[PDB]
Design a binder for this molecule. Structure first.
Ligand SMILES: O=C(N[C@H]1c2cccc(O)c2C[C@H]1C(=O)O)c1cnc2c(c1)CCCN2
Length: 167
């Protein structure tokens, strides 16, 4: 039993809810919240900009030190950093950005990072300002992640479309 509330169950291990991931994180304080990161951990907009704003920019300060030490992530890769006031840990995962021409096949590699964590609160990778089809992202999630994932979808219209079209 865990504290996630109000989710629709899609499969054995994948759950989905129309929710603001920032507000969901503040309430649940999950072990892991996933950020929709870029390789530079520049959290300017989308999910990343919103999570960083909720940490009062502490996420960005920590991220800048990480990059100065380690260099950029790979598209499809991840790193574990602090969850600040939102979660124990933040898993920063880089899905491909279609608006940069990145190979959508890398989306499966991106979701594989979730399998290193037993339970996660996450957005749909490569959705939103990353330019991929969220229906496709949900399909890759279900077909790749084997650990327990609680997906937060900000847009109610998109949420209803994702549920109604789910196979
Ligand atoms: O862009 C947002 N989400 C989308 C997003 C962003 C970045 C990467 C992604 O793969 C996605 C999928 C989108 C979604 O999940 O629908 C977003 C933007 N601003 C916000 C919030 C969410 C929630 C807190 C308040 N401010």
């Amino acid at each position: 039993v865990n504290s996630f509330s109000g989710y629709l169950k899609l499969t054995d291990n994948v759950y989905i809810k129309n929710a603001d991931i920032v507000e969901e994180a503040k309430k649940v304080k999950p072990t892991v919240v996933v950020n929709a990161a870029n390789v530079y951990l520049k959290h300017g907009g989308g999910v990343a900009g919103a999570l960083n704003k909720a940490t009062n920019n502490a996420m960005q300060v920590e991220s800048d030190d990480y990059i100065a030490t380690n260099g950029p992530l790979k598209v499809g890769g991840s790193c574990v950093l602090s969850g600040h006031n939102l979660a124990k840990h933040c898993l920063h995962v880089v899905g491909p950005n279609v608006n940069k021409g990145e190979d959508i096949q890398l989306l499966k590699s991106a979701y594989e990072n979730f399998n290193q964590h037993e339970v996660l609160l996450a957005p749909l990778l490569s959705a939103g300002i990353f330019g991929a089809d969220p229906i496709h992202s949900l399909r890759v999630c279900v077909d790749t992640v084997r650990t327990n994932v609680y997906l937060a979808v900000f847009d109610k219209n998109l949420y209803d479309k994702l549920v109604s079209s789910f196979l």
